[PDB]
Amino acid sequence: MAAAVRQDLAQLMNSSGSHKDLAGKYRQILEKAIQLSGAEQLEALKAFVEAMVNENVSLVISRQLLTDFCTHLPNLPDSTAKEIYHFTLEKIQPRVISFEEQVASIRQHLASIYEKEEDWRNAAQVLVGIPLETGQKQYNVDYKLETYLKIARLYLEDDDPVQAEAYINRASLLQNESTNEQLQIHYKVCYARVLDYRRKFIEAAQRYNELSYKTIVHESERLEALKHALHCTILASAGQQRSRMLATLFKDERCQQLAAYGILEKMYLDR
Amino acid sequence: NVDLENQYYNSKALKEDDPKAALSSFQKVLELEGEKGEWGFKALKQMIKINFKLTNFPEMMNRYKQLLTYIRSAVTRNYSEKSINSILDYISTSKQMDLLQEFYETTLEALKDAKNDRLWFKTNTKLGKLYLEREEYGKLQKILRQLHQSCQLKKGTQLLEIYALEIQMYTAQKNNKKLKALYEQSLHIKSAIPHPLIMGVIRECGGKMHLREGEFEKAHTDFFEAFKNYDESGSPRRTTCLKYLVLANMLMKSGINPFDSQEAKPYKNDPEILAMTNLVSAYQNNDITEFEKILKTNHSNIMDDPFIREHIEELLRNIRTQVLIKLIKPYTRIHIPFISKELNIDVADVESL
Amino acid sequence: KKRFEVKKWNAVALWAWDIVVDNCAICRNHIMDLCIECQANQASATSEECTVAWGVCNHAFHFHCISRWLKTRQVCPLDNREWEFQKYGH
Amino acid sequence: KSPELLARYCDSLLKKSSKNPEEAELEDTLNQVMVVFKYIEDKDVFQKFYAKMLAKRLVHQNSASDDAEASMISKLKQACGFEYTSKLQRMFQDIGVSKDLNEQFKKHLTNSEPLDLDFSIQVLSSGSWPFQQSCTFALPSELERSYQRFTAFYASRHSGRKLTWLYQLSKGELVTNCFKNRYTLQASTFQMAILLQYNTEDAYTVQQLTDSTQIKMDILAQVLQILLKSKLLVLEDENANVDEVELKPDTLIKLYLGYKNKKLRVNINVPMKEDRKLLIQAAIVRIMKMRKVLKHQQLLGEVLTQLSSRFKPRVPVIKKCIDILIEKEYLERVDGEKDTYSYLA
Ligand SMILES: [Zn+2]
Ligand SMILES: [Zn+2]
Ligand SMILES: [Zn+2]
């Protein structure tokens, strides 16, 4: 057993005084414990986050040390990162209001590695835990808008349209006063996908048609919007509304480039 | 003088679990208190509290008669009212009805001349509340007799408190006739500022009486007001006027989802109101298959109270009527047996409908 | 033990609804859309833009929906009381 | 200015002083105030400064005779109308609701693990009070647990409601265990946090306090100034006059161990401190010419459609515009309907 490091962790907590000089000493020890082969590496980091959330440590060096601790996790392999991320969230849970900033960054990191591993359900759940409304800190509007779109998109790929619609509803309250042009474009792409998933085909066709006229997006993305508009219009409910949209799509010159154009021209001529 | 504050603060600084030691230390306080001061009020409160812990019942009632001399002009009315409210509250948890009962009769003797109009009014109303929870309907009547000779406006707020008390009283007696008169008796007052729990009993009984009478457009707004006020202040009866609000909305020919307002949306997923929110979603966008299945599943949450089981026959007919109207819209000649299949009723009842 | 100990705290807070508004309870469409009637007829009027209208009860319907509803009835759809315009804008 | 003066009179009257007027004479002088009140031609402005005066009276629990407050608003409601006293009715009901809320919270505490401090909170309400969260603040480590506890109590009771705590208007009481004797001072949350920062060490620099409490510069400077006024924080140069001392983020301020104030109830929490109308009239007359007979609500909606897209006017201004245009005989009321206007040019 090699655990001759954990003893001085608690010893330094009960020192005469904690200052900036001692804070830099932890970097040297941490920089060598991280450079380790197996389970002996895990133990040092696990106790580091345990002995820091304690009340005995003042929340003036603890906050700085926690964000520095979390920033070294993306360099660590994700197999261990998943386990440690769950532990630190549980230990911060008793006192969350103090660390209302470190929690958000940790859950964003955890969700990023979950999505890359193709786990949409669990990645979405992690991002829900982030307090974006029921918190004392006022987040940036673009930050809340970006986070909501990620939750909605992950739910769409999970094939859970009911939950995705709820979070896209929260994201549509910030579009009107947001200033990020790219964020507005990104929202409408996700909103149109949500409508298509909810089998509201004619409404999604209108959104795709309008989105196809955006000069901001690339030419390749413009044709993708037109393709989705054509499929939704064909799949929509026949009537006065759908017939009017069918005429509009026929005028478009780019509609001839798709393999599903022959079906479009037959439904346009009441064939 | 500064010495008065220091003397009072020293006694509370010591836990002083040993009794009869602080009593000699309060004789100093009274001598030091020359004029009328707020510190004297606090001194009497603490010695009553300490003496009450180690029983010794004949002590508190003697100091209490001295205590009402402070409510006159020594301190404000908020402080004196809060002191009385706190003292009478936490002693009732220990049962000991006799000690509380002897206190009310003695306080009424001197308080009747110290603070006449408002403080006596609320103390009397609180006493009436005790009689209701112990179900002693043999002496509450004389209290309302006293309140009868109190108005003969500019006294609207006090009138609503007693009117709500009477409605809550006669409700347990199932006196529907007097409830209708009482509800109209409170409608004249329109310049009062009541607690948002008094305007949650006269309003609920207004919706209930409208339900029995046959009005469904007045019960909807009355039950919404009852739910709104019960939600702000209080708790238990909140998820009963919301269920009634839902029922009073489907009997009104529906339209507009009740669980779309800001107040009712959080409770749409409540385990107690899950039966009702499913009922509305089936009623609107009429479909019989889902509506009947909900009724069959829940015999423990819907067909229990008289207010839903009696009005379940007005429903299951409005939805069938609306299905019938929409179905026969495009047809010009349609078979009655075909209608029977689409309504899940026999041929004879379709002709009657 | 501790040098300074807190004994009493008298805080002040402000309660607000978590969701200010999420649906127009007349056309059942979302707040940011074109009020259903003005959705199917996608031509103009969107210039006026279906900016929401807040009543005294703070219920926030679409202006097109509430104005169309007010032509015959003078009661709010939800609370069934008198409707009075209080705010207009996003 | 006269309305303001009358309202400040009202403020004294109801607020609180060393002598409390009897309930009999308290309504007597209130009746005299209403005698002159109806003579006041303009009623809208009176509510403007009465709202903030009342809010400060109630949020600090400095009000006297809260029963008289209920009757005072009751007299006002029948004078001008519901709409004129709707906002003030919300303020009074919030105080009553939160007072009941505190009683239930205390009972909930006993059945679970008790707290370490006496906690009371006024919940107020959003949209009806002039207050707003304006100063960022870091919650002290000692006032967090109770915080969380109350949030739980406000999540089981009320669902779908979010609390926005206002540390600027929150006070408290702080005991001491290191002075010559046992003291009990009263201070705001900011002063409490600053004084609790010194719990583990002796001296801190100004920047070391700014980065630990996250209070903004101006409020932090004011709080340090008032704390220095109470001679609780002593600078290195005692002989320098405190008022003219220029504060920089380098002074090493230390807690005054030898504090020996005679009074044991030191209170350091002492308080500090036309063109559009023509446009609305033009819009109203144009709408009235276009629609010969209209209702009040439809006219308000049309005015909001045509004109509110520019500067978002206030509804009472539009109502006053309607009234003055009625006085100018530009549009007349129609008998048989209380709210109906006809464009009579
Ligand atoms: Zn709408
Ligand atoms: Zn529209
Ligand atoms: Zn309403």
Approximate helicity band of chain A:
55-70%
Question: Biggest interface between protein chains, with counts per chain?
Answer: C-D, 36 and 59 residues
CATH architectural grouping of the largest domain in chain D? Up-down Bundle
Span between N and C termini of chain D? 37 Å
CATH superfamily of the largest domain in chain D: Cullin Repeats
Largest sheet of chain A: none
* Radius of gyration of chain D, whole Å: 27 Å
Shape of chain A: elongated
Round the Cα radius of gyration of chain A to an integer and report it.
26 Å
**Tally of structural domains of chain D:** 4
What is the number of beta strands of chain A? 0
Helix residue percentage of chain D: 40-55%
Q: What share of the residues of chain D does DSSP label as strand, in percent?
A: 5-15%
Beta content of chain A comes to under 5%
Question: Which descriptors would you attach to this protein?
Answer:
4 chains; B: 353 residues; D: Ring Box Chain A, domain 5; Arc Repressor Mutant, subunit A; three-stranded antiparallel beta sheet; 10% strand; binds zinc ion; Cullin-1 (chain D)
Detailed description of the structure:
The structure is cut from a larger assembly and holds chains A (271 residues), B (353 residues), C (90 residues) and D (345 residues). In chain A, 64% of the residues lie in helices and 0% in strands. In chain A, helix 12 packs antiparallel against helix 13. With 271 residues, chain A is mainly α. With 353 residues, chain B is mainly α. In chain B, helix 1 (2-13) runs antiparallel to helix 2, helix 7 runs parallel beside helix 9 and helix 13 (238-250) runs parallel beside helix 14 (274-283). Chain B is elongated. The N and C termini of chain B lie far apart (88 Å). Chain C has one domain (1-88): Zinc/RING finger domain, C3HC4 (zinc finger) (Herpes Virus-1, 2-Layer Sandwich). In chain C, 13% of the residues lie in helices and 24% in strands. Chain C has helices at 37-40, 63-70, and strands spanning 4-12, 15-17, 52-55, 61-62, 85-88. A three-stranded antiparallel beta sheet of chain C has the order 4-3-5. In chain C, strand 3 and strand 4 (61-62) form a beta hairpin. Chain C is elongated. In chain D, a hairpin with a 6-residue loop joins strand 9 (332-333) and strand 10. Chain D starts with a helix and ends with a strand. Chain D has a three-stranded antiparallel beta sheet. Chain D has a three-stranded antiparallel beta sheet with strand order 8-10-9. Chain D has a two-stranded antiparallel ribbon with strand order 3-4. In chain D, helix 4 runs antiparallel to helix 5 (86-110), helix 10 (275-290) crosses helix 11 (296-306) and helix 10 crosses helix 13 (315-327). Chain D has helices at residues 2-14, 23-37, 44-59, 66-80, 86-110, 145-156, 189-197, 206-213, 217-229, 275-290, 296-306, 308-311, 315-327; strands spanning 118-122, 161-163, 171-176, 184-188, 203-205, 233-234, 252-255, 293-295, 332-333, 340-342. The A-C interface holds A 133-134, 169-170, 172-173, 175-177, 203, 206, 241 and C 18-20, 22, 30-32, 39-40, 42, 90. Bound molecules: zinc ion (3 copies). Residues 24, 26-27, 29, 35, 61-62, 65 of chain C line the site of one zinc ion. It is classed as signaling protein. The entry lists the keywords COP9 signalosome, signalosome, N8CUL1. Cryo-EM structure of COP9 signalosome precatalytic state with neddylated cullin-1. Chain A: COP9 signalosome complex subunit 4. Organism of A: Homo sapiens.
